[PDB]
Short mmCIF file of C-alpha atoms (C1' of nucleotides) and ligand atoms in Angstrom, two decimals:
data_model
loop_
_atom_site.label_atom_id
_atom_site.label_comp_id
_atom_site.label_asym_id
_atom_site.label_seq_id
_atom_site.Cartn_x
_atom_site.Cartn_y
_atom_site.Cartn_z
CA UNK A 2 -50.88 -22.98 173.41
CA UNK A 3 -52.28 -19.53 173.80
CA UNK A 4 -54.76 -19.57 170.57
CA UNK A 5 -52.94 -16.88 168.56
CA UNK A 6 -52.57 -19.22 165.40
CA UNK A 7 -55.31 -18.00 163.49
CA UNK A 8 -57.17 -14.55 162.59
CA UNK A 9 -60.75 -14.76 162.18
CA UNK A 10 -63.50 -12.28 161.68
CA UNK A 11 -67.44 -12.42 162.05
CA UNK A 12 -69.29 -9.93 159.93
CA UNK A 13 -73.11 -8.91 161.14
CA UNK A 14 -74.64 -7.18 158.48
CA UNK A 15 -76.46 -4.12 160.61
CA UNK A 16 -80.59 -4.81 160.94
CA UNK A 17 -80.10 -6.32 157.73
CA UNK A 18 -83.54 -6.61 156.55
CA UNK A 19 -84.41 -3.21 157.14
CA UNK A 20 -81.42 -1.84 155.32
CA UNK A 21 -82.72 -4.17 152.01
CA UNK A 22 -86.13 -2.04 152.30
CA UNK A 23 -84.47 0.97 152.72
CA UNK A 24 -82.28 0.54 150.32
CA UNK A 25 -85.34 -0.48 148.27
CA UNK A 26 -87.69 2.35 149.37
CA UNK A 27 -85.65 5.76 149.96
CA UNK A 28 -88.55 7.40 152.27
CA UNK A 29 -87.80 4.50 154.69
CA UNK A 30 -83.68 6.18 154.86
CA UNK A 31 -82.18 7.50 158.40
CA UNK A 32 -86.38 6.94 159.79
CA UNK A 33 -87.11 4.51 162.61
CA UNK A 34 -88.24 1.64 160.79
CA UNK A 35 -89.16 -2.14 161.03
CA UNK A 36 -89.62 -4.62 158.60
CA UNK A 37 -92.71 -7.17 159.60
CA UNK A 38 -94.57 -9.83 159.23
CA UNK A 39 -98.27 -11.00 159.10
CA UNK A 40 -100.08 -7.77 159.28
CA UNK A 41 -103.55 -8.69 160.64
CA UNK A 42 -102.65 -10.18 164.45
CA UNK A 43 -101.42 -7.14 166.36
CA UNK A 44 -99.90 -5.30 163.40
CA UNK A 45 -97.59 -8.05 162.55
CA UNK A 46 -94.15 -9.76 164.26
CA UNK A 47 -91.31 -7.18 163.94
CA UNK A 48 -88.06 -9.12 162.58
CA UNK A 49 -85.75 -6.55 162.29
CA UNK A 50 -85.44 -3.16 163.58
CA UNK A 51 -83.35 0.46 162.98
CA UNK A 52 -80.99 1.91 165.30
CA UNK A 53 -83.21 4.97 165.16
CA UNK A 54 -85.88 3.21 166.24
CA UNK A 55 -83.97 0.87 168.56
CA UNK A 56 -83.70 4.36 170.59
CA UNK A 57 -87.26 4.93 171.39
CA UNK A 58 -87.19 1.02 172.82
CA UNK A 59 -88.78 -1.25 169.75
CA UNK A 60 -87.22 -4.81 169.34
CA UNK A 61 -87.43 -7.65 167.39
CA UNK A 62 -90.64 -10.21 168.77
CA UNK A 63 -92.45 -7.20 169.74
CA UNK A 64 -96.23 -6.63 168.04
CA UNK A 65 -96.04 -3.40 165.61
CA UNK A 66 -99.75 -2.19 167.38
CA UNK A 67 -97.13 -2.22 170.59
CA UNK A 68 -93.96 -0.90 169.35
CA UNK A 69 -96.00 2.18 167.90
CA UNK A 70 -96.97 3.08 171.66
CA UNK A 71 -93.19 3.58 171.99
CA UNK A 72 -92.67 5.09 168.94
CA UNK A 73 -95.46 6.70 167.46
CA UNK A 74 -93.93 7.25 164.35
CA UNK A 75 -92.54 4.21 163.30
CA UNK A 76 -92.49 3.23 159.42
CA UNK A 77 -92.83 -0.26 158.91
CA UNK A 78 -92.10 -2.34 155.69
CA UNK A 79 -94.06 -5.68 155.28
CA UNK A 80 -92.42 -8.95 153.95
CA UNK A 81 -93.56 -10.55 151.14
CA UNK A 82 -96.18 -13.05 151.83
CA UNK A 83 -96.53 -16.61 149.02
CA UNK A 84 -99.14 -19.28 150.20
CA UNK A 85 -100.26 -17.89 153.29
CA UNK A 86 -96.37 -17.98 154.80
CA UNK A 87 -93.34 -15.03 155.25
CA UNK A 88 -90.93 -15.50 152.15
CA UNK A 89 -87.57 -14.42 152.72
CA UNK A 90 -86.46 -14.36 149.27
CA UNK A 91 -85.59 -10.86 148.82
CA UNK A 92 -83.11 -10.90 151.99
CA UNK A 93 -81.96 -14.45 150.98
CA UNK A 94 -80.84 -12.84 147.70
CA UNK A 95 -79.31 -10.09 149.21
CA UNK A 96 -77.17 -11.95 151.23
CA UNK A 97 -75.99 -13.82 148.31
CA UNK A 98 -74.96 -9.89 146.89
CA UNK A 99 -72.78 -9.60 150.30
CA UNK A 100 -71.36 -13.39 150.48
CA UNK A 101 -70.33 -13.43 147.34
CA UNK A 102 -67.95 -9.62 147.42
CA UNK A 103 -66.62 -11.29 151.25
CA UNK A 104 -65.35 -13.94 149.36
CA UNK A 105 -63.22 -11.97 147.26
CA UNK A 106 -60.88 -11.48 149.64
CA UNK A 107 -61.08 -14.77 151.91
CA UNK A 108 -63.02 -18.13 152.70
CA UNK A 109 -65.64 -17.62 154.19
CA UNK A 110 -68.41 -19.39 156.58
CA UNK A 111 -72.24 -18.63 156.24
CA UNK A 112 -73.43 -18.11 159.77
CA UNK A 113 -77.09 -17.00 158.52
CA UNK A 114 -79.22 -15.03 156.18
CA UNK A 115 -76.66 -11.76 157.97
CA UNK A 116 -73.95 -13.03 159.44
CA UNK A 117 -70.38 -14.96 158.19
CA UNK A 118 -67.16 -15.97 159.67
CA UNK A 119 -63.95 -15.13 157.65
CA UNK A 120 -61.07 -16.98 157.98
CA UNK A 121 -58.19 -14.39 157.05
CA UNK A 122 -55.04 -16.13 158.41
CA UNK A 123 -53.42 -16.82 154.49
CA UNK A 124 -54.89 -13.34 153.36
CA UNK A 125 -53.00 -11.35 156.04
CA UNK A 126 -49.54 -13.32 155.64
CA UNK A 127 -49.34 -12.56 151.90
CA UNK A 128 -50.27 -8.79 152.84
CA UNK A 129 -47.71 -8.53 155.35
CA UNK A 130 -45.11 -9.67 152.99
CA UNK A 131 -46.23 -7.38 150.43
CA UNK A 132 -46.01 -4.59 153.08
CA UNK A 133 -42.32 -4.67 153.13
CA UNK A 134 -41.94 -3.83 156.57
CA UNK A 135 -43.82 -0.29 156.35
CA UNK A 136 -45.76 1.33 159.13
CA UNK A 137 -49.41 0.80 159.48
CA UNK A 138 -51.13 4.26 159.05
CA UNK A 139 -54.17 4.74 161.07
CA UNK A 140 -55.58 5.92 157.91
CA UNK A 141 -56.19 2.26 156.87
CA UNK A 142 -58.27 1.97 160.20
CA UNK A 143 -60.41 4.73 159.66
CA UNK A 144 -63.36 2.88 161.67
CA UNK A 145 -61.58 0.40 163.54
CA UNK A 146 -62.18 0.13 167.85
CA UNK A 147 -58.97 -1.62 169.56
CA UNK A 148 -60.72 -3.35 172.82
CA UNK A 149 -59.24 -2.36 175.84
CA UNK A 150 -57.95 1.32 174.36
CA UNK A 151 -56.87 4.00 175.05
CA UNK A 152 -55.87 3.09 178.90
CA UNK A 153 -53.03 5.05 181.40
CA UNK A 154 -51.69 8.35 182.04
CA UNK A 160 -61.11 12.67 175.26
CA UNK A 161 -64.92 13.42 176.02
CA UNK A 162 -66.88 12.31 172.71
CA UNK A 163 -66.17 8.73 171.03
CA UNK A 164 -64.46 9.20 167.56
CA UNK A 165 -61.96 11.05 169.71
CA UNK A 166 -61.75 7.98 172.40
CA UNK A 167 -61.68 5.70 168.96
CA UNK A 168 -58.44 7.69 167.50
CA UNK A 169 -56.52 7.90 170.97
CA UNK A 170 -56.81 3.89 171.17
CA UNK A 171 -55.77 3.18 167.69
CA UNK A 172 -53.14 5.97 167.77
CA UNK A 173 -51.75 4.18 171.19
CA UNK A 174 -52.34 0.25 169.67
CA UNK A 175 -50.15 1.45 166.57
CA UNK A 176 -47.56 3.53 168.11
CA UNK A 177 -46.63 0.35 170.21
CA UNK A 178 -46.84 -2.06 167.10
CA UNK A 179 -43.88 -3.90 166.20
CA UNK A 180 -43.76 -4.18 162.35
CA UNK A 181 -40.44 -5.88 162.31
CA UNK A 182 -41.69 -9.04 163.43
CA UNK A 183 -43.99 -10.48 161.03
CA UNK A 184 -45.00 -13.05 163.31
CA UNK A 185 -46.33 -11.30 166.39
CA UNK A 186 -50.21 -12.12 166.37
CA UNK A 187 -50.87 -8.54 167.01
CA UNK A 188 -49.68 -7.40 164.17
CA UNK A 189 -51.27 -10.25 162.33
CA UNK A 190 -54.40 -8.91 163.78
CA UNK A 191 -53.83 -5.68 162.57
CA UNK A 192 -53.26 -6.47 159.44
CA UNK A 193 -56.58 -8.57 159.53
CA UNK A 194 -58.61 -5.73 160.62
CA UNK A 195 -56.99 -3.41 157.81
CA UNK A 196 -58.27 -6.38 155.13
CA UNK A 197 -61.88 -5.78 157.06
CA UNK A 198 -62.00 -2.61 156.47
CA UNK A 199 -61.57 -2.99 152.68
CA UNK A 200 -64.09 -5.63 152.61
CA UNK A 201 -66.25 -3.69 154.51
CA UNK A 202 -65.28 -0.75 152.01
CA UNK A 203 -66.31 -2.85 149.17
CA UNK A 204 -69.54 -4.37 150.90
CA UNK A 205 -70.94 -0.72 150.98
CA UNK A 206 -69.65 0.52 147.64
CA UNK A 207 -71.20 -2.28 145.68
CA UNK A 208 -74.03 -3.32 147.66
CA UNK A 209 -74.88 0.38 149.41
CA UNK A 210 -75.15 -2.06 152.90
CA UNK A 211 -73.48 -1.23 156.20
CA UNK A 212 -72.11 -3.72 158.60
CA UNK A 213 -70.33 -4.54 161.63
CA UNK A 214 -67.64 -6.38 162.44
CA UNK A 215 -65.15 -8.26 164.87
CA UNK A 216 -61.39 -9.56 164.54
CA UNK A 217 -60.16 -12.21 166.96
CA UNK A 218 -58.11 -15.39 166.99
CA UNK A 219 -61.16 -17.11 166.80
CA UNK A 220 -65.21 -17.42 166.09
CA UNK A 221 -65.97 -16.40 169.65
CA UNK A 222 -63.57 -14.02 170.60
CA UNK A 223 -64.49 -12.49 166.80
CA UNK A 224 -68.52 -12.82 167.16
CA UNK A 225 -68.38 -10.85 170.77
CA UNK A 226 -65.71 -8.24 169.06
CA UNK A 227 -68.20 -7.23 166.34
CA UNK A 228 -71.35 -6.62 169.16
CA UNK A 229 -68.98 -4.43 171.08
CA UNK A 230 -68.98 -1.05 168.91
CA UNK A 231 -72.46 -1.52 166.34
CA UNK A 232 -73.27 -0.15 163.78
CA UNK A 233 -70.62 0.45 161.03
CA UNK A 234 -67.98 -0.45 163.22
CA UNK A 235 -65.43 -2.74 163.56
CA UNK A 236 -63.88 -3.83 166.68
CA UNK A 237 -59.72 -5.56 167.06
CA UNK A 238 -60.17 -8.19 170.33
CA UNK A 239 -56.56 -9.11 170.83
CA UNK A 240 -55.26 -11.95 173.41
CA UNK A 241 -54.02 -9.57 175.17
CA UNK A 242 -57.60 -7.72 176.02
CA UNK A 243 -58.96 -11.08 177.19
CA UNK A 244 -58.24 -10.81 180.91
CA UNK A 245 -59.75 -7.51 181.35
CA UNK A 246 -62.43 -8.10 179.01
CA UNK A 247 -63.54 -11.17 180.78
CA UNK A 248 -63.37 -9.87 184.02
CA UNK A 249 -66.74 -8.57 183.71
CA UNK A 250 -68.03 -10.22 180.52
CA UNK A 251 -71.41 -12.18 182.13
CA UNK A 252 -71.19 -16.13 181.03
CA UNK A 253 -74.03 -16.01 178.89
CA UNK A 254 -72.68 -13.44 176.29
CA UNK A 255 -70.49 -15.93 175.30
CA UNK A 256 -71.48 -18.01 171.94
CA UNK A 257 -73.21 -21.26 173.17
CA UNK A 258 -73.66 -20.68 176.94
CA UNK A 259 -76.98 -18.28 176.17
CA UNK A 260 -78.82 -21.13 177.16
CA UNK A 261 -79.37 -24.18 179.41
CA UNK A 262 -75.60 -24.83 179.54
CA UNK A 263 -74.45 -21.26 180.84
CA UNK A 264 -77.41 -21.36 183.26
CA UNK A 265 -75.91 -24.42 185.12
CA UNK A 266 -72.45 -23.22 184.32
CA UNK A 267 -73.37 -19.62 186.73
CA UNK A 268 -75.39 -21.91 189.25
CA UNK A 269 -73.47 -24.94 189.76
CA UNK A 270 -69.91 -23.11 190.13
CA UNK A 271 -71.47 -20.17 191.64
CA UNK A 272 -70.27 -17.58 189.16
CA UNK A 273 -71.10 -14.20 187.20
CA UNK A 274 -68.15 -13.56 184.63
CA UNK A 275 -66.45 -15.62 181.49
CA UNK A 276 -63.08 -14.75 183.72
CA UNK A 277 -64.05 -16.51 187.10
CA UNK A 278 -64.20 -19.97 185.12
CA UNK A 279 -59.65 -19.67 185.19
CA UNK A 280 -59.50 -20.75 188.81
CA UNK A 281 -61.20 -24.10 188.22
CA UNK A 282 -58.99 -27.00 187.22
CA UNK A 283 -60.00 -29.07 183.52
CA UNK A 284 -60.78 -31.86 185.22
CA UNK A 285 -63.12 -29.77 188.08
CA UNK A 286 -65.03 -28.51 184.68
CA UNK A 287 -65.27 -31.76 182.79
CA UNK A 288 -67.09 -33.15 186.31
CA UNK A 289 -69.45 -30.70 185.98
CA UNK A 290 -70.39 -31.01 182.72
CA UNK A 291 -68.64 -33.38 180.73
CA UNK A 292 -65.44 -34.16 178.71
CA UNK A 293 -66.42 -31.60 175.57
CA UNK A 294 -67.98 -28.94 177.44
CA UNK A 295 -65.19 -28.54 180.62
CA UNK A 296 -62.05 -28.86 177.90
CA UNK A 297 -64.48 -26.45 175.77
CA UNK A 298 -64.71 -23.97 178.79
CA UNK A 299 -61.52 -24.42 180.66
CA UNK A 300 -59.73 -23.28 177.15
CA UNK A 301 -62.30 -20.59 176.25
CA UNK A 302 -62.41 -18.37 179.57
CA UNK A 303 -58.39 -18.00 178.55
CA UNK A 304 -59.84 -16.87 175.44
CA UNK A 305 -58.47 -20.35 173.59
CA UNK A 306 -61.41 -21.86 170.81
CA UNK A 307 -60.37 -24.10 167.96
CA UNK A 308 -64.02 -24.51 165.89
CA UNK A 309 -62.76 -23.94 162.36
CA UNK A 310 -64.00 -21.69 159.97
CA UNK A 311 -65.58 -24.21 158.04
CA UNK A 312 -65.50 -23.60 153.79
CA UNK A 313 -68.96 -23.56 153.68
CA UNK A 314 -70.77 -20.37 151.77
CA UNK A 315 -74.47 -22.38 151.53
CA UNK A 316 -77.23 -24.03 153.69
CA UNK A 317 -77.28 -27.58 154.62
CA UNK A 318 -81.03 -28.31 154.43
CA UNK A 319 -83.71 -26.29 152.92
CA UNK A 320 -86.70 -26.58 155.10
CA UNK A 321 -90.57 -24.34 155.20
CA UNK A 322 -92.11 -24.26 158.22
CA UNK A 323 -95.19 -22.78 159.54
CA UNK A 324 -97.02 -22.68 163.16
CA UNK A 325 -100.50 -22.48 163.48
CA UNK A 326 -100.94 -21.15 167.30
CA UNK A 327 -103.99 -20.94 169.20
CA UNK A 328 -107.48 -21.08 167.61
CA UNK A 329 -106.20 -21.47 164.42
CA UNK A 330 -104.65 -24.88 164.92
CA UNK A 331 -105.08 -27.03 161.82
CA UNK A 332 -107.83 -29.76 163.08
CA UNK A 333 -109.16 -31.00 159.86
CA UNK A 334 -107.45 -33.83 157.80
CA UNK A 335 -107.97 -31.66 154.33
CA UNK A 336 -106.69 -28.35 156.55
CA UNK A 337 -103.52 -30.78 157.00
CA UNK A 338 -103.05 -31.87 153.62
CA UNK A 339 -103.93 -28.17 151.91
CA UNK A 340 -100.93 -26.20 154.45
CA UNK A 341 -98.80 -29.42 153.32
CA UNK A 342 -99.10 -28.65 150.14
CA UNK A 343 -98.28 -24.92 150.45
CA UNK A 344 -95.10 -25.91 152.65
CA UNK A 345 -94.22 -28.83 149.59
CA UNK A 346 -94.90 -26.32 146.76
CA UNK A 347 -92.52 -22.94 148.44
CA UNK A 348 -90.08 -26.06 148.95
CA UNK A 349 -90.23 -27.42 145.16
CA UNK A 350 -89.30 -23.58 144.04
CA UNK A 351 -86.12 -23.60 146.48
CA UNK A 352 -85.10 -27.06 145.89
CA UNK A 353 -85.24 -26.49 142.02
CA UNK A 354 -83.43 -22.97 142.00
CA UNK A 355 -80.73 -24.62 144.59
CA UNK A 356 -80.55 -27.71 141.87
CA UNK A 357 -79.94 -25.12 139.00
CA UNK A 358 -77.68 -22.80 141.13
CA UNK A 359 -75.25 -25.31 142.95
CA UNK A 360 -75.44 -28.48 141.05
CA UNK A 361 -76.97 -30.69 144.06
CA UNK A 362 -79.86 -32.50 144.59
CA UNK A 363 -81.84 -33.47 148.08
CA UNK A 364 -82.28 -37.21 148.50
CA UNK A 365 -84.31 -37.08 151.89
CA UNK A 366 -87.14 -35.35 153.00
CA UNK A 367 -87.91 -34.85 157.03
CA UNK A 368 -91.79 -34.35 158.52
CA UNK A 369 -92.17 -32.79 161.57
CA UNK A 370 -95.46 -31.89 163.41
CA UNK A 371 -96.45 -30.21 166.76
CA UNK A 372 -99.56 -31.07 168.52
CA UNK A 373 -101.51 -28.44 170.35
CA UNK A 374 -100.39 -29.27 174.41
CA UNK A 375 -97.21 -29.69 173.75
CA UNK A 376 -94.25 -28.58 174.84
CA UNK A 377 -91.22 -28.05 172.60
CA UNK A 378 -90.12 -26.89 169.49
CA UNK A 379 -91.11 -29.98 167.85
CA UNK A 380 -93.61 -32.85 168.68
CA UNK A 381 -92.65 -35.96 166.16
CA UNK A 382 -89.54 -36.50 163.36
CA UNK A 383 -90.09 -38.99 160.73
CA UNK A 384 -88.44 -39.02 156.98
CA UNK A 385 -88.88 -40.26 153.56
CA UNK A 386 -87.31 -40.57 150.36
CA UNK A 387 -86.93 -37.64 148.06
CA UNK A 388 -86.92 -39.21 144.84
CA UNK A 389 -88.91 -35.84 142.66
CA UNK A 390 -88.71 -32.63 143.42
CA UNK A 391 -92.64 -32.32 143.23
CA UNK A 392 -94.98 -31.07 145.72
CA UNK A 393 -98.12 -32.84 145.59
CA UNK A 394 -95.56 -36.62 145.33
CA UNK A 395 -93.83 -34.36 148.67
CA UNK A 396 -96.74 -33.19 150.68
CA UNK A 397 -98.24 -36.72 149.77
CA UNK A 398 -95.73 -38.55 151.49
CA UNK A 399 -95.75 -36.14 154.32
CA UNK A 400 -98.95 -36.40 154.93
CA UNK A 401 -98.44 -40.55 154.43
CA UNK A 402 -96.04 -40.54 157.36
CA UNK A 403 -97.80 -38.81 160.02
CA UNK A 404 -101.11 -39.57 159.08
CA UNK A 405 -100.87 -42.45 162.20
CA UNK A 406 -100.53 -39.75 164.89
CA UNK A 407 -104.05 -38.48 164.33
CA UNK A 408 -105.31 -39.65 167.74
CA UNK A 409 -109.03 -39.29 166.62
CA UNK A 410 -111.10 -42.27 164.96
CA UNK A 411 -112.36 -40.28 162.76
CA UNK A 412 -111.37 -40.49 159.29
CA UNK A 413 -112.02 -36.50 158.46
CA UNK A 414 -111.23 -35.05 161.21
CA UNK A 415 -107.56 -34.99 162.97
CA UNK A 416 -107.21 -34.76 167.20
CA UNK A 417 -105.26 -33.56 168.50
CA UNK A 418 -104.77 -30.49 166.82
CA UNK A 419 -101.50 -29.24 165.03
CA UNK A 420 -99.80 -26.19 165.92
CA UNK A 421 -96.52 -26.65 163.77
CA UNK A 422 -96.16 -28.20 160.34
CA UNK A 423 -92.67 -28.88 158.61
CA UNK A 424 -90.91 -30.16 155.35
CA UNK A 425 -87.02 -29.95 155.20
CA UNK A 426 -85.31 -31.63 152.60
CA UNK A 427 -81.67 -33.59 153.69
CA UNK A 428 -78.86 -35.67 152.80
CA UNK A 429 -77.79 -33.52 149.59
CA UNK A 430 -76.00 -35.77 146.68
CA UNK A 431 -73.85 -33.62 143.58
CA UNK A 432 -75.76 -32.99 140.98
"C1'" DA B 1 -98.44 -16.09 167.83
"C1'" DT B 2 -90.88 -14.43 168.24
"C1'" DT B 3 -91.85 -16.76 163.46
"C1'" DC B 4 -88.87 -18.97 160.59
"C1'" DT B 5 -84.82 -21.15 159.85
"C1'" DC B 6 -80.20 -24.09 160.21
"C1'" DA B 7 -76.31 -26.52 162.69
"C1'" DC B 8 -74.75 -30.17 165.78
"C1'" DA B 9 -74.43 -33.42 170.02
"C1'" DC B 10 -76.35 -37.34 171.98
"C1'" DT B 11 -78.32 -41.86 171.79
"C1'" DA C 1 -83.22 -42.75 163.02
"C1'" DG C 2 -85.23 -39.66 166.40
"C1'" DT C 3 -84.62 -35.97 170.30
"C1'" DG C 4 -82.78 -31.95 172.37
"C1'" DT C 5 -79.93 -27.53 172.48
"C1'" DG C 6 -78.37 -23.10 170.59
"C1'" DA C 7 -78.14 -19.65 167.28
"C1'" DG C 8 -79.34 -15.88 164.05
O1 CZU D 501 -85.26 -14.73 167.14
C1 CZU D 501 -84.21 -14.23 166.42
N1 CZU D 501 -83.19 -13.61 167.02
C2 CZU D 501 -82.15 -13.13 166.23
N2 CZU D 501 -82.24 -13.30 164.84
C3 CZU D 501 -83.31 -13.93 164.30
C4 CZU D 501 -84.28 -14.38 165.10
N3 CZU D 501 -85.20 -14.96 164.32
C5 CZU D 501 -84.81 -14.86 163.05
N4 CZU D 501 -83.64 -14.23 163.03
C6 CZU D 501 -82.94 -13.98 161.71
O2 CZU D 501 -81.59 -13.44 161.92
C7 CZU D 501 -81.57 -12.19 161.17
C8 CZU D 501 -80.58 -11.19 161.76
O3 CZU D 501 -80.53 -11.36 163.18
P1 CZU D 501 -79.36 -10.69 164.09
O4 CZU D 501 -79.55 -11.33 165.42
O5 CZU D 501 -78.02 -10.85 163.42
O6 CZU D 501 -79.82 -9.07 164.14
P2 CZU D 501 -80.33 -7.96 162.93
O7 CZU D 501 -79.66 -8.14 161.60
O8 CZU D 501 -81.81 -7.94 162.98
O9 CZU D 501 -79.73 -6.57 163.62
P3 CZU D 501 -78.34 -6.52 164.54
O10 CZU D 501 -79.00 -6.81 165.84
O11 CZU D 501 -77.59 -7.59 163.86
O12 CZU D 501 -77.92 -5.13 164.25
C9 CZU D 501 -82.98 -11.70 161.36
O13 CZU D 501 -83.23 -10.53 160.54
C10 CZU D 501 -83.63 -12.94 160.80
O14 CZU D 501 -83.17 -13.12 159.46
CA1 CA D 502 -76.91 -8.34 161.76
#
DNA sequence: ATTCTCACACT
DNA sequence: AGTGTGAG
């Protein structure tokens, strides 16, 4: 098995929420920009960022007051605020724009609001036998990077760019329409159209990779942003690997990868080949070692799973520092707001895509603690209405206020959240 | 005060 | 059901 049975892409749409202001608000156009969010601490939370301001050092999770000491003129674009929370609708609906042309042309996987897997392994057999047998031009690659090209025996990069694809086609071999290069190829010239048609009907520029797989595909399309697209074949893995650090990789950016670099004593995707399976499933279990003794020889079998739209719809809000909720009608009033932005979504998803949400999930965090989320607890979702909702969430945590106190509520909450589950046709 | 999401494995 | 990890 050498995981060359399928071709795969993942499409990043590039800093996609600035491009939906900009596209929006011509002044922000070719400016460093960032799009924010809640304007009075610091200048607000920058969530998305231009490549021209990406130059002068500003990221996402810095402060604006900060990122305007590196750049001091940065234009910033505000999201739209409902109930005292960030509301994404705008992007959300702009995604749907994108999704929706992508999936003219093959099934496709929502990663998030930006991002999609497409599965293009039927799509590029019928266009290989409606290509006769016919050269591939490198005209129909006109912004296509082939990893690992040009190599052997050109000083700026669209020159570098047209000496690797030049050398990747000249060696194709169109006869065979079975060789997964070629099958790649063709893949990457159905990206490019997509890609062509993304920007035509949307005016939005993105990125993207074409592997045998979701990984392979998803560290393609970071290797040559923005408005590129990047060809990984099977036969770039070794190299590419060599020096590719473990936590690049999709799901070893975290806990997992740590332990992965400090338990075998390792730097590089490639250095996990000399272990056996079995070594790796010692380590760190049946999944994981199979997982990672197939993936460092670039091997991954995680579908692309037909699945354009969300699982849950949840609203969430944190409350950090001082301004941790520690009243019982503070509790019940930000309830509300989170049950009220989730009757809208729940109602427009019931209208849209014919389902309805049958269970609804609480969660809280208490000021002191440590993770993500304190408590879980659920309850039925018989109505989509807010004050029924936010009444039963409030019903089934009301028990972990600490404090005897009937008004007030110890100890106080730094995180509330609604997310509706277990979705039934409609 | 990276916030705000969403998916999945484990138990 | 409830917790923990990983991601965009
Ligand atoms: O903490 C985060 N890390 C990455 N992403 C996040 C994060 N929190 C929320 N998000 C959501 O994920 C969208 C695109 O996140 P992304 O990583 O694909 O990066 P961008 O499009 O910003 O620019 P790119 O770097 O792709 O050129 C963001 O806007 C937002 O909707
Ligand atoms: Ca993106």
């Amino acid at each position: 098995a050498t995981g060359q049975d399928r071709v795969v892409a993942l499409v990043d749409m590039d800093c996609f929420f600035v491009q939906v202001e900009q596209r929006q608000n011509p002044h922000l156009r070719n400016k460093p920009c960032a799009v924010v969010q809640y304007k009075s601490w610091k200048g607000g939370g920058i969530i998305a960022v231009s490549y021209e301001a990406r130059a002068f050092g500003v990221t996402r999770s810095m402060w604006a007051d900060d990122a305007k000491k590196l750049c001091p003129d940065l234009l910033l674009a505000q999201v739209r605020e409902s109930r005292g929370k960030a509301n994404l609708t705008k992007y959300r609906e702009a995604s749907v724009e994108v999704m929706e042309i992508m999936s003219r042309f093959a099934v496709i996987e929502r990663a998030s609001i930006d991002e999609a897997y497409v599965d293009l392994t039927s799509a590029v057999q019928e266009r290989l036998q409606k290509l006769q047998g016919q050269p591939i031009s490198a005209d129909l690659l006109p912004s296509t990077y082939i990893e690992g090209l040009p190599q052997g025996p050109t000083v700026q990069k669209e020159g570098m760019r047209k000496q690797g694809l030049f050398q990747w086609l000249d060696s194709l071999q169109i006869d065979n329409l079975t060789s997964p290069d070629l099958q790649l190829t063709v893949g990457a010239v159905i990206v490019e159209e997509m890609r062509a048609a993304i920007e035509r009907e949307t005016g939005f520029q993105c990125s993207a990779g074409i592997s045998h797989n979701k990984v392979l595909a998803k560290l393609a399309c970071g290797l040559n942003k923005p408005n590129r697209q990047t060809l990984v074949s099977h036969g770039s893995v070794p190299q590419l690997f060599s020096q590719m650090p473990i936590r690049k990789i999709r799901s070893l950016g975290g806990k997992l990868g740590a332990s992965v670099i400090e338990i075998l004593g390792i730097e590089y995707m490639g250095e996990l080949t000399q272990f056996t399976e079995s070594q790796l499933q010692s380590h760190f279990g049946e999944k994981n070692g199979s997982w990672l003794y197939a993936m460092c020889r670039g091997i991954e079998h995680d579908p692309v799973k037909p699945r354009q739209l969300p699982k849950t719809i949840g609203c969430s809000k944190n409350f950090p520092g001082k301004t941790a909720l520690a009243t019982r009608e503070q509790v019940q009033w930000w309830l509300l707001q989170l049950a009220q932005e989730l009757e809208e979504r729940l109602t427009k998803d019931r209208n849209d895509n014919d389902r309805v949400a049958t269970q609804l999930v609480v969660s809280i965090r208490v000021q002191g603690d440590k993770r993500l989320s304190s408590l879980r607890r659920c309850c039925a979702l018989t109505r989509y209405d807010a004050h029924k909702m936010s009444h039963d969430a409030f019903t089934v945590i009301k028990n972990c206020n600490t404090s005897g106190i009937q008004t007030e509520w110890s100890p106080p909450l730094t995180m509330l959240f609604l997310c509706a589950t277990k979705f039934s046709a409609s």
